């Protein structure tokens, strides 16, 4: 039974989201639909992505490292490799385990990119594993085409490149035809000033492998993401309730659900066109969430884009398989 | 009942340790005993530490930032504040939530410290939350006395300072009488070359608050830590099985246990002098673990210091309250 995949702690403060590893505190409806594959599992034990259900480090041992010009001090360091080159990843060779599923946001001049996935780390020496210590920085990671001269976003892994670019100047740039990337897998969001931005990533930024099924509304049932408060570079001190705005990141699944789906096969749980339904019991009122065979969650919220606060969620109880045709209750 | 605190996934690949957030893959006996309080809970709902049972970010908004000399390029950046100054931490004002419980390892010259807790981040501007972008680096964090001129390790929080020092040169140093620290809470271990070192932290490096109870052997029952593979700075690419050696970090508890202990009070579970016992069932053979009222785990391994491999652990079953006087079975 899927029932124990989603239990009370998962959405009441313990569970984190499968993209940012942030404590889930809201449900973000997506009336326009979305797709996600990375660190996302279905009910047949499979992922279309390239990441295990954990947050550790991003490591690839063979890419091109460079910086522009004849002066190496305080430069933007660029690392890139081809998607499909992660030979040492048994899940998928598309990208290193943990590489974020977000399209690259280009940046130049004095401009910090908006809504980039950013992680800390740097370049390392492919011949011995030692870091190039003068390249440690915050790096934007994403999928692109056209590197090195003009990396531009792409949202398919097919024909893509994986790119890392420091968002601030490194102490001393490194040019190496073969060099490694090391970045910690729990990210922050790039912003150019103190203001919070929209929930990140927006659907049109998410990178998906060929074959990834899409989540679309079914009647009044609308796909959701799981929202957590995520740090942002323009005001790195900001937390929940900041007067400069609260920043949300979102993921397609609670990580505890992803973990469970990755450990057992649930393919006999649902018949075609069913959700597995749970009831979310608030201090007053309740709502239902439905899980599809493809691993996406739904709420009965129709066209509403408004974040649903989970602070008054008390517990979760399983309902069972139900038709996706039936409107999920939303009675808060 | 404590029974569901420790279930099969906690030690068979899902659970991470409460110091490094690494996947637990071994049990490390500590025949000489140890103490731990940070991100450690007891069975009466309480911690002596200063950290919540999660890994997010370390943030303190008021410390002294400096570098030595009249040349600001490629310098070691130092940040320090007094222990007890974390006013915004409701768990404890000893230190910012997530600050590591390890004594500071001094370093100078061209020397990278051995066995330091290292995290990525930098200094930020107390007046607005914006990072000082030229200070991003890998930083050693620990407790010390004698900063700024001569920080030296301490293992009590009483009268201590909290220190962060970049282990590599920052692009441009910053001198500020009041400045913030931001460091991601999942660390790596500093090493000066490619070799793995002993499990980290060793008992004599762990920083404890006043009142913290110690774990000592009880008959043939010996306290243990939970070991995970942790990255090291001297060979940042090394993972499990590296020919340069496998590096372990250890924590006093599996994080899922810490979480459970922080959410409910278990003080009626055990009578004085009892362990709550679980049986660990391997492909062949079995052993018992016991949990004391103070939240420490024990195994019946006596004087053995050898890491116990969990790769062949299949499942866990609860036994119940038993006298700590009874030798925990070790029959692998
Ligand atoms: C020079 C100036 O005007 N600076 C302000 C800065 O002081 C503000 O910080 C907030 O101040 C209030 C009290 O006045 C509280 O102390 C808030 O906690 C604090 O906001 C927090 O810190 C700042 C630095 C940001 O990181 C913010 O995201 C945090 O929530 C800010 C915001 O009011 O405005 C100016 O920068
Ligand atoms: C120039 C040179 O001789 N370098 C070697 C380096 O190549 C070694 O790495 C190992 O090489 C074997 C094949 O010969 C495998 O490819 C290993 O995966 C590789 O070890 C891994 O990469 C190195 C860079 C380290 O990060 C190590 O921890 C990894 O496990 C190493 C070790 O044998 O020695 C020299 O540096
Ligand atoms: Na959970
Ligand atoms: Na990793
Ligand atoms: Na990988
Ligand atoms: Na660019
Ligand atoms: Na592809
Ligand atoms: Na740098
Ligand atoms: Na938004
Ligand atoms: Na677990
Ligand atoms: Na107590
Ligand atoms: Na935090
Ligand atoms: Na020092
Ligand atoms: Na103290
Ligand atoms: Na720097
Ligand atoms: Na050791």
């Amino acid at each position: 039974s899927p029932a124990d995949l989603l239990t009370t702690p998962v959405l009441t403060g313990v569970g984190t989201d499968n993209r940012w590893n942030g404590e889930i505190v809201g449900l973000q409806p997506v009336p326009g639909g979305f797709s996600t594959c990375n660190r996302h599992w279905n009910l047949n034990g499979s992922t279309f992505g390239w990441s295990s259900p954990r947050f550790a480090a991003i490591d690839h041992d063979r890419g091109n490292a460079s910086y522009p010009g004849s002066s190496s001090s305080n430069v933007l360091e660029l690392w890139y490799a081809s998607a499909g080159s992660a030979a040492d990843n048994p899940i998928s060779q598309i990208a290193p385990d943990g590489f974020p599923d977000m399209s690259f946001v280009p940046f130049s001049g004095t401009t910090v990119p908006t809504a980039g996935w950013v992680g800390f780390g740097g370049i390392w020496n492919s011949s011995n594993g030692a870091p190039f210590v003068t390249t440690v920085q915050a790096y934007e990671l994403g999928f692109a085409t056209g590197a090195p001269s003009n990396p531009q976003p792409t949202t398919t892994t097919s024909g893509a490149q994986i790119v890392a670019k420091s968002i601030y100047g490194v102490a001393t740039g490194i040019n190496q035809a073969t060099a490694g990337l090391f970045v910690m897998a729990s990210g922050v969001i790039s912003t150019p000033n103190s203001s919070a931005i929209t929930y990140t990533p927006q659907p049109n930024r998410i990178v998906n492998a060929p074959g990834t099924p899409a989540a679309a509304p079914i009647g009044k049932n609308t796909p959701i993401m799981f929202a957590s408060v995520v740090r942002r570079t323009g005001d790195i001190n900001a937390e929940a309730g900041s007067t400069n705005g609260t920043q949300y990141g979102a993921g397609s699944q609670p990580l505890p659900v992803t973990v469970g789906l990755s450990l057992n096969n649930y393919s006999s749980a649902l018949m075609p066109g069913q959700f597995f339904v749970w009831q979310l019991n608030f201090a007053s009122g309740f709502m239902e969430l439905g899980l599809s065979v493809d691993g996406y969650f739904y709420a009965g919220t129709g066209a509403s884009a408004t974040l649903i606060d989970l602070s008054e969620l008390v517990d979760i109880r399983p309902v069972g398989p139900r038709p996706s045709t039936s409107t999920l209750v939303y009675n808060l």
Side-chain angles (χ1 to χ4, degrees), chain A:
Chain A
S1 173
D4 285 346
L5 292 169
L6 191 75
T7 61
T8 295
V10 178
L11 299 181
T12 55
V14 179
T16 66
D17 77 277
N18 69 341
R19 181 171 286 116
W20 299 99
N21 201 28
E23 176 193 337
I24 296 164
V25 292
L27 308 173
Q28 178 59 69
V30 190
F34 72 99
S35 296
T36 293
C37 64
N38 196 44
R39 208 177 289 101
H40 177 112
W41 258 254
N42 66 20
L43 273 64
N44 193 35
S46 306
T47 187
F48 283 83
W50 52 89
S51 300
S52 55
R54 66 181 171 108
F55 290 86
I58 305 161
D59 180 2
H60 189 67
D61 66 10
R62 182 184 30 100
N64 181 282
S66 72
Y67 66 91
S70 58
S71 166
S72 64
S73 292
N74 301 303
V75 294
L76 305 181
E77 182 76 22
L78 177 72
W79 181 98
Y80 74 93
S82 184
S85 69
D88 56 22
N89 186 345
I91 298 170
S92 168
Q93 293 77 63
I94 286 170
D97 190 340
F99 196 96
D101 64 352
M102 288 167 54
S103 65
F104 189 73
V105 183
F107 59 99
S108 63
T110 54
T111 300
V112 174
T114 296
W117 188 101
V118 169
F120 296 91
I123 315 303
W124 60 268
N125 185 331
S126 297
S127 73
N128 61 21
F132 287 111
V133 304
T134 68
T135 70
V136 178
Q137 253 301 344
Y139 285 76
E140 184 195 355
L141 277 57
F143 287 75
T145 62
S149 72
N150 186 23
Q152 290 294 323
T154 183
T155 54
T156 178
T157 58
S158 189
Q161 299 166 309
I162 50 172
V163 176
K165 187 176 177 168
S166 67
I167 62 168
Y168 313 128
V170 298
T172 299
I174 292 288
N175 288 314
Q176 288 288 339
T178 303
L181 180 70
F182 176 87
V183 176
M184 302 296 291
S186 299
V188 306
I189 294 160
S190 66
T191 56
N193 56 46
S194 64
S195 298
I197 62 177
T198 53
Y199 78 81
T200 305
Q202 292 283 300
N204 66 5
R205 292 282 310 295
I206 305 172
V207 180
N208 291 289
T212 299
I218 302 168
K220 291 179 179 186
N221 297 327
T222 291
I224 65 159
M225 302 191 213
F226 297 85
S228 62
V229 176
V230 174
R231 297 280 176 165
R232 66 191 183 259
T233 62
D235 177 358
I236 200 71
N237 179 234
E239 298 168 4
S242 167
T243 68
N244 290 332
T246 297
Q247 182 66 56
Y248 295 97
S252 68
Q253 301 179 322
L255 189 64
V257 175
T258 313
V259 169
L261 291 173
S262 78
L263 289 170
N264 288 100
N265 188 294
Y266 290 90
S267 62
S268 72
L270 299 177
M271 293 178 293
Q274 294 185 313
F275 291 153
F276 194 93
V277 179
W278 292 264
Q279 189 172 295
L280 276 54
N281 294 320
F282 289 66
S284 183
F286 70 105
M287 64 179 289
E288 297 174 316
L289 293 182
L291 176 62
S292 75
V293 162
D294 286 329
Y296 294 108
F297 286 88
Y298 292 74
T301 47
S304 182
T306 315
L307 181 67
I308 301 167
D309 184 10
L310 293 170
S311 68
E312 299 187 345
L313 177 63
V314 177
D315 65 27
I316 297 175
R317 297 287 184 268
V319 172
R322 299 290 188 274
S324 61
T325 59
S326 294
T327 299
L328 295 159
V329 173
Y330 184 60
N331 189 14
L332 299 183

